[PDB]
Each structure stands twice: as C-alpha cells, then as structure tokens.
Amino acid sequence: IIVTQTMKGLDIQKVAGTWYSLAMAASDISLLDAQSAPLRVYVEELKPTPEGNLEILLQKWENGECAQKKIIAEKTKIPAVFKIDALNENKVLVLDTDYKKYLLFCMENSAEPEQSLACQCLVRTPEVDKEALEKFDKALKALPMHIRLAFNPTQLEGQCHV
Amino acid sequence: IIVTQTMKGLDIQKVAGTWYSLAMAASDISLLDAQSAPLRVYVEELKPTPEGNLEILLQKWENGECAQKKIIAEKTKIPAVFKIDALNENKVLVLDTDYKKYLLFCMENSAEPEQSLACQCLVRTPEVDKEALEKFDKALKALPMHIRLAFNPTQLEGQCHV
C-alpha cells in the first residue's frame, strides 16, 4: 500500500531553474529497469508559471536517441500536488525541498499506484549530495520500492545519464 | 572503496540445496541494469563438494533465452572466500548465513572491485523475508552500491525472475 506525504508550505516559484536527477526509485522494477524503461527520465529544468502551474523539462531515451521532453503539470488545491497526463502517470507529487540544494518528488498514476510510482532526488549541482540522498532514502523506507538507482557526477552531466 | 566482511565460522556443507535470489545490488548500474546485464543471475542451487569446493547452479538471460549455468568455485584458506573464473569475476564471498533461511554473498573481481561488485540475498523459500532483507541492507549500507533490485514471490518462482 502506497501512502505518499506531500510537502507542507511549498512555494513553487522557488523551484525554478536547473536540476539534476541524482537518484530514482520505483515500485515496479520494469518502470526503471533498462535505459529505455518508461519512467527512466532525467529532469533538466523546472519552470513554474505565473498561474502556479509547472513545466518540467527532461531527457529520455526513446528509439535509440537521447530525446527532449516537456511535461505540463497543472496546479491543484494542494500546493505540492499537480496533475499531469504523460508517461502513463497522472500526478506529480513534491515531497520536500529546500529550494537551494535538493528536491524530492514522485510521479504516479493514482488509479494504480503500485504499478506506477517512481520518485527522484534532484540536486542543483551535478555532484553527489549525501544529505539529500539521506532524506530521499528516509522517504523511500516508508514506500514499497523494488528498484533503486544512484548516479555519479560523470553520469549527472552526461547526455541521458551515460 | 570496497571493503567486504566475510562470514566467520562458515560450514559450507550446510548451504547445500535449493535457494532463491530475493534481492541483488551492485556497485555499477550496468552490472544489473536490464535483464541481460552481466551479473543479472538467479541462484537455484548451491552444491558443496567433499573437497570443500562449491558448485553454483544459476539461471541467466542470454540471447533472448532463459539459460542454465554452472559456476565452479574453489576453496581458499579463508572458508567464506572461494575462487572462480566466470562472469568476469574471480571471487565469491559469503557474508552471512543461518543455513536454514537466508544467505548473503557477493561476487567481485579483486583487480577492479568498484567495477565488479554484486551481492545477493538468497532465501530457502520463494517468499519475501523482511528479516533477511534487513541483514542484506545492513551489509549494503557500508558498500558503495548504485543499483538495487528486490523481487516478489511471483518473480521468485518465474523463469529467470519474470
């Protein structure tokens, strides 16, 4: 059973800018297993809009190419929950952030959480932040994850994390 | 830097019989990333020999087929360390076992540990043993792992963990 805890007091305008996907984890192995896995996506930029919506710019391998992708997330009554329709997911969920160093978020499809949940640890610089990873693992300890990936600085600034 | 701690007082004859790979983790993502990854291997049987050597029977995907494989491990002066020449690894390292429920082991290539280290949690029954996984994660906390997989009962009794 998946229960996510979203951030209290999120100010979405402060997440703006460049990020790097330091780590990711998912409920089903197939979601992240192999570079072509559906939720193997690497966040490059978060771009809040004046409406309080959010554009997510990411990279993703598809048909052998490292491709760009833009996901549009719509605000909801809860500030840390946004609605999307992409990657067969329907929610982007912000778990925690300090704006300046790390941000934790998940995606899921609320109709099928155990088949769809993937969460990431994002960082502002392409370095490994052990404190951020500690917060990430803390959150993940409470979730039924079956796959976990953690990247190094070389992979962080690679194209599609190679 | 990899430092492994091998089991004190291992009696190899007691590990005999059927096992299942409940979980696995590795230092480099590529070692386990995708079903075809080099160290994506699923242990079926451990067969100690009268000499104190060890045959390891496993399954592994290769060229689209779920294939059988036998690895012959030679004893060394340390009872929990065996020598092999397979999967580009040269050591099998037993970390801990209670013989009756779980067994923890790694493989590595001592010439290049950070490029080669993969460890597993094995169990006697195709069920999930949270206590065994706790011991596994405990060991892994001290190691620089960058990928982690945990399987369910259906996968445990699948062919090549599908």
Side-chain angles (χ1 to χ4, degrees):
Chain A
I1 190 201
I2 293 154
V3 159
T4 47
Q5 306 289 347
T6 52
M7 183 174 175
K8 289 267 173 276
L10 175 65
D11 301 322
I12 196 72
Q13 295 304 322
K14 295 158 98 196
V15 308
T18 291
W19 299 90
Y20 301 86
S21 305
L22 177 57
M24 50 187 72
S27 58
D28 272 3
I29 288 161
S30 50
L31 298 171
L32 294 184
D33 197 10
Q35 60 161 209
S36 62
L39 302 183
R40 198 88 162 245
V41 296
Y42 311 102
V43 177
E44 290 166 311
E45 254 206 279
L46 289 182
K47 323 220 296 172
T49 77
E51 296 72 39
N53 297 324
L54 178 70
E55 293 187 315
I56 304 164
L57 301 189
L58 49 89
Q59 291 184 320
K60 182 184 183 290
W61 287 109
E62 56 189 339
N63 302 161
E65 305 283 302
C66 186
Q68 295 301 314
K69 200 188 198 310
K70 171 183 281 178
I71 292 174
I72 289 154
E74 176 172 50
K75 79 179 159 177
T76 73
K77 287 161 178 132
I78 308 169
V81 179
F82 296 79
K83 163 178 176 160
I84 59 167
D85 184 20
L87 314 176
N88 296 327
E89 301 287 54
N90 70 345
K91 302 184 157 44
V92 166
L93 278 14
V94 183
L95 271 37
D96 199 53
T97 185
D98 71 350
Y99 308 107
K100 271 75 202 160
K101 284 147 88 168
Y102 74 98
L103 181 158
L104 311 188
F105 84 94
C106 307
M107 290 169 331
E108 66 179 45
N109 182 341
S110 52
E112 55 199 58
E114 288 81 27
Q115 288 180 302
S116 64
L117 174 75
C119 304
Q120 310 204 351
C121 179
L122 307 176
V123 286
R124 289 291 203 178
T125 51
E127 300 311 310
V128 182
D129 184 337
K130 299 204 192 188
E131 223 131 59
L133 289 174
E134 258 164 45
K135 290 154 182 292
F136 188 52
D137 294 335
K138 184 96 209 305
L140 267 29
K141 194 160 148 46
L143 292 159
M145 302 307 224
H146 294 94
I147 181 162
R148 216 168 313 267
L149 306 177
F151 299 91
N152 69 44
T154 305
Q155 291 157 336
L156 287 185
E157 69 214 350
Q159 287 283 302
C160 282
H161 287 215
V162 180
Chain B
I1 190 201
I2 293 154
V3 159
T4 47
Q5 306 289 347
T6 52
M7 183 174 175
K8 289 267 173 276
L10 175 65
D11 301 322
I12 196 72
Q13 295 304 322
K14 295 158 98 196
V15 308
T18 291
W19 299 90
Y20 301 86
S21 305
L22 177 57
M24 50 187 72
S27 58
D28 272 3
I29 288 161
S30 50
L31 298 171
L32 294 184
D33 197 10
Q35 60 161 209
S36 62
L39 302 183
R40 198 88 162 245
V41 296
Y42 311 102
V43 177
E44 290 166 311
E45 254 206 279
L46 289 182
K47 323 220 296 172
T49 77
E51 296 72 39
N53 297 324
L54 178 70
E55 293 187 315
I56 304 164
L57 301 189
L58 49 89
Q59 291 184 320
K60 182 184 183 290
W61 287 109
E62 56 189 339
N63 302 161
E65 305 283 302
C66 186
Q68 295 301 314
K69 200 188 198 310
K70 171 183 281 178
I71 292 174
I72 289 154
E74 176 172 50
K75 79 179 159 177
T76 73
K77 287 161 178 132
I78 308 169
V81 179
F82 296 79
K83 163 178 176 160
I84 59 167
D85 184 20
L87 314 176
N88 296 327
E89 301 287 54
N90 70 345
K91 302 184 157 44
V92 166
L93 278 14
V94 183
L95 271 37
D96 199 53
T97 185
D98 71 350
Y99 308 107
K100 271 75 202 160
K101 284 147 88 168
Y102 74 98
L103 181 158
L104 311 188
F105 84 94
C106 307
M107 290 169 331
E108 66 179 45
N109 182 341
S110 52
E112 55 199 58
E114 288 81 27
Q115 288 180 302
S116 64
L117 174 75
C119 304
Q120 310 204 351
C121 179
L122 307 176
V123 286
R124 289 291 203 178
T125 51
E127 300 311 310
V128 182
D129 184 337
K130 299 204 192 188
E131 223 131 59
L133 289 174
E134 258 164 45
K135 290 154 182 292
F136 188 52
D137 294 335
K138 184 96 209 305
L140 267 29
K141 194 160 148 46
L143 292 159
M145 302 307 224
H146 294 94
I147 181 162
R148 216 168 313 267
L149 306 177
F151 299 91
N152 69 44
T154 305
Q155 291 157 336
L156 287 185
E157 69 214 350
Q159 287 283 302
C160 282
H161 287 215
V162 180

